[PDB]
Design a protein around this ligand. Structure first.
Ligand code: SF4
Ligand SMILES: [Cl-]
Ligand SMILES: [Cl-]
Length: 150
């Protein structure tokens, strides 16, 4: 049984600033070693480059600070994450917290002022809407338990 994981959490240099968000986790390393952790970046899958400007949700829209509307790429990325889960039989996702794509408990408030609020990214919202459970990197014990139970 496999999971989909934000590519940056696996150390891939796909974040908007070219860096990674690699986490230290013996459990996640073991899952990857078994071919069970499928790396996926919704923004790169959706056609955005690396690096790319910071973006925030404004309701259903996703925009950069200059007003460029990148919702099309964000939605494509979300739909491709769902497509990957349906094709592979995946029911769990481990996604990066705070992201306008991968956030699950919090996101930036759309005002470009470093202020977070309760909410979720576009990919997380679509996956949850289709019965896929999404956990952040702050919820590894719950994800590991959910995965082992089935
Ligand atoms: S879109 Fe998600 S997986 Fe891709 S770099 Fe941003 S937080 Fe990581
Ligand atoms: Cl950052
Ligand atoms: Cl963050």
């Amino acid at each position: 049984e496999k999971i989909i994981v934000s590519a940056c959490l696996l150390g891939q240099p796909v974040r908007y600033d070219g860096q990674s968000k690699g986490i230290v986790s013996n459990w996640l390393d073991a899952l990857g070693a078994e071919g069970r952790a499928l790396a996926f970046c919704p923004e790169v899958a959706g056609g955005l480059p690396t690096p790319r400007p910071p973006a925030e949700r404004q309701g259903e829209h996703v925009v950069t600070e200059s007003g460029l509307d990148v919702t099309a790429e964000f939605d494509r990325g979300a739909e491709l994450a769902l497509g990957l889960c349906l094709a592979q039989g995946i029911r769990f996702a481990l996604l990066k917290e705070g992201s306008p794509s991968c956030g699950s408990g919090r996101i930036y408030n759309g005002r470009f002022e470093g202020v977070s609020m309760a909410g979720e990214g576009k990919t997380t919202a679509l996956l949850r809407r289709h019965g896929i459970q999404v956990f952040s990197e702050d919820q590894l014990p719950e994800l590991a338990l959910a995965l082992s139970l089935v």
